[PDB]
Design a binder for this molecule. Structure first.
Ligand SMILES: CC(=O)N[C@H]1[C@@H](OP(=O)(O)OP(=O)(O)OC[C@H]2O[C@@H](n3ccc(=O)[nH]c3=O)[C@H](O)[C@@H]2O)O[C@H](CO)[C@@H](O)[C@@H]1O
Lengths: 11, 705
């Protein structure tokens, strides 16, 4: 999706 | 009764052309055209000779004629396409190749040329397909075979690698022995196991091409200056490059011209490229004593005239056998001393090159037989990078302790910024971890750290904390494009997280940001061994190109590595690429062809780099950078030592912290990124060369002060 969205989320 | 007088003359011209009597070849061709104007073969042969001479316009005239006489002349269509391609008419060349393929579907040369156009434009699958088609039509096609081999190297397709390499060596030997132009490009010869004599000879033939192109000019030798009297005692140094602009070479040396001592030197910059509007070109134009746009002077004779009229004492080739090169200028020898410096990691093999500027680590005198030029040593390393000027925001960093009770991690959530210290001074309880005047601040898990992590996780571009601007590391182009390219220093505080690139929050990250062509099966084998010996550890590669990614993974699966042990990321803007190297623990240099600019990039991030120096220049640059850094423990004498050092860095976390801190300090303390010191030592070498020539001596090896 968005180029700024990360691969995974932090706890 | 096929033989005619014109047929005889065309033959005799062919014989004189194979003898190397090019002028007699064209005379006999023209005589044959005189006897028989509608002689299509004579038109084609004369056009081929003219195109080899650089007379592209007249060659296109004769090709178009020959195809008017014989509309089924597929070879003439293919060669007209080649001439148009040399004239930068890619659409016309494409039309010529496709018309040839339509006329004679069995004609292999047109398929090979179409594959060449596809490869030049970056369509590697298409180039591979057309090269395979051509080789199917003509199994003995050295040009198509070598270009296909390079395409496979680009995509890391190592199917039948050993047989491919052996066939490449055999083809190169056969073409050298028969005095034909080798089908392996000199820039690619560093990727194959030829003898150093083979690589030098390929370079020599490709320089001979420039010699043949300049002979038609019939220029007399230039009268070179014998003293510095006319230039106020200043050595006149002219850097010739097509990369004054947004190119890695400028990223390496853009500060050098402005750091030259005006009292003893006069700096001329000859750009072979037009202004591309970037700040690199602006800086070189504004800081050099004289900027000369040779892209406005296509005729090599007139551009060499300009170089000579400026009075250059030392002319510096920073292009070599790379793109945009105009070695014809150097073949005309307008300067008494001509030296290869930075852009080409190999020998020119050419007589018009007097020196190659290198160092003892990259080119020890033992292998001085690899290079046709004489060795000119820099004190520590010949490599330089402008990172201290382009990316000063990575000189200091800070981290967030996301893992509430987690021993401090330096590469999971990282912050960089020119205003980082003021931002931290606005924070309540920053903890300062000393690394053994250098320190890493740590932000505890506050609402502030939660806000930063929320910005990262939600994929937001930017936030504001205490009036300070905090930017997502992935959004630099959306905030300041000039900052992302490295043309400007970022004016916000940038956050970089492993979560942005899928890296393990709890594991060792080995990285290699080089183009995938530098990887060979042996290198992947060593990396697989290292990954097996370190638990949870992953290897971080780039989609460079993305079509190479599946290949690697496939091979990695045959060696026992799951798909989750190699993490691929897309190629990022320059600033983000250099910045995100902080997230890795150890970089693993490619032994076949070292990372050269990539090595500077990773070392600037403070990431220790493991190298195994080879024999070719390109395979030893990483080692030289590491010696100049002062990190001799990161250089390996064999594959096993390489693997041992890598797994030790991965498993001994205290040793990892020690070596990482060592690199973090040495990248400033050592001369590696010191552009002023590098310029001064280069000036010392320049004066060494000039005094050697001024005493009447022919060029010789320059080592020791
Ligand atoms: C084998 C070879 O020919 N190496 C040349 C190369 O070094 P080197 O091999 O390191 O660099 P490349 O030719 O592969 O160019 C890679 C460039 O892309 C940049 N990058 C990479 C990944 C990414 O995500 N984002 C990004 O911006 C790198 O910072 C670098 O500027 O260029 C130097 C500068 O001309 C030459 O002196 C070297 O001889």
């Amino acid at each position: 999706q968005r180029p700024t969205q990360p691969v995974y989320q932090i706890q | 009764s096929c033989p005619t007088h014109a047929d005889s003359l065309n033959n005799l011209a062919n014989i004189k052309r194979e003898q190397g009597n090019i002028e007699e070849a064209v005379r006999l061709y023209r005589k044959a055209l005189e006897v028989f104007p509608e002689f299509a073969a004579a038109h084609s042969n004369l056009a081929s000779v003219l195109q080899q001479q650089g007379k592209l316009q007249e060659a296109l005239m004769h090709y178009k004629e020959a195809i008017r006489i014989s509309p089924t002349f597929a070879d003439a269509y293919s060669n007209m396409g080649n001439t148009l391609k040399e004239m930068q008419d890619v659409q016309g060349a494409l039309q010529c190749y496709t018309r040839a393929i339509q006329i004679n579907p069995a004609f292999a040369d047109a398929h090979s040329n179409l594959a060449s156009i596809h490869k030049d434009s970056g369509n590697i699958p298409e180039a591979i397909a057309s090269y395979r088609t051509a080789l199917k039509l003509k199994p003995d096609f050295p040009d198509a075979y070598c270009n296909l081999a390079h395409c496979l190297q680009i995509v890391c397709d190592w199917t039948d690698y050993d047989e491919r390499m052996k066939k490449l060596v055999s083809i190169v030997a056969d073409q050298l022995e028969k005095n034909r132009l080798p089908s392996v490009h000199p820039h690619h010869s560093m990727l194959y196991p030829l003898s150093h004599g083979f690589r030098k000879a390929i370079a020599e033939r490709h320089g001979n091409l420039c010699l043949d192109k300049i002979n038609v000019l019939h220029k007399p030798p230039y009268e070179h200056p014998k003293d510095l009297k006319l230039s106020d005692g200043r050595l006149r140094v002219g850097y010739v490059s097509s990369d004054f602009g947004n190119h890695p070479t400028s990223h390496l040396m853009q500060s050098i011209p402005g750091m030259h001592n005006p009292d003893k030197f006069e700096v001329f910059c000859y750009a072979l490229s037009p202004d591309d509007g970037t700040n690199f070109r602006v800086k070189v134009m504004a800081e050099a004593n004289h900027f000369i746009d040779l892209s406005q002077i296509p005729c090599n004779g007139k551009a060499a005239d300009r170089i000579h009229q400026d009075g250059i004492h030392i002319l510096v080739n920073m292009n070599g056998y790379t793109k945009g090169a105009r070695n014809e200028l150097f073949a005309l020898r307008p300067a008494p001393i001509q030296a290869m410096w930075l852009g080409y990691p190999g020998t020119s093999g050419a007589l018009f090159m007097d020196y190659i500027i290198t160092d003892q680590e990259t080119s020890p005198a033992e292998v001085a037989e690899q290079y046709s030029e004489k060795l000119a040593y820099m004190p520590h390393t010949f490599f330089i990078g402008d990172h201290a000027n382009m990316f000063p925001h990575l000189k200091k960093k800070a981290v967030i302790d996301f893992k509430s009770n987690g021993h401090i991690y330096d590469n999971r959530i990282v912050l960089n910024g020119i205003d980082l210290k003021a931002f931290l001074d606005s924070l309540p309880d920053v903890k300062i971890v000393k690394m053994k005047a250098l320190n890493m601040p740590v932000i505890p898990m506050n609402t502030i750290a939660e806000a930063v992590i929320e910005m990262i996780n939600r994929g937001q571009i930017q936030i504001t904390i205490n009036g300070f601007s905090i930017s997502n590391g992935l959004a630099t182009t959306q905030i300041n494009n000039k900052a992302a390219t490295g043309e400007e220093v970022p004016r916000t505080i940038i956050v970089t997280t492993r979560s942005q690139y899928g890296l393990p929050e709890d594991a060792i990250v080995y990285c290699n940001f080089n183009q995938l062509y530098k990887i060979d099966p042996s290198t992947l084998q060593m990396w697989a061994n290292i990954l097996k010996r370190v638990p949870n550890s992953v290897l971080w590669l780039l989609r460079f190109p993305a079509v190479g990614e599946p290949n690697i993974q496939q091979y990695a699966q045959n060696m026992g590595l799951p798909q989750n042990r190699i993490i691929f990321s897309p190629v990022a803007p320059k600033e983000e690429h250099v910045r995100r190297g902080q997230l890795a623990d150890v970089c693993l240099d490619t032994p076949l062809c070292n990372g050269h600019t990539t090595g500077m990039d990773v070392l600037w991030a403070g990431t220790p780099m493991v190298t195994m120096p080879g024999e070719t220049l390109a395979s030893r640059v990483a080692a030289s950078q590491l010696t100049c850094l002062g990190c001799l423990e990161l250089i390996a004498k064999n594959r096993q030592e390489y693997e041992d050092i890598a797994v030790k860095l991965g498993t001994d976390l205290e040793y990892l912290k020690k070596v990482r801190g060592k690199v973090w300090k040495q990248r400033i303390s050592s001369p590696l990124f010191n552009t002023k010191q590098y310029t001064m030592e280069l000036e010392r070498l320049y004066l060494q060369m000039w005094e050697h020539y001024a005493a009447g001596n022919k060029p010789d090896h320059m080592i020791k002060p």
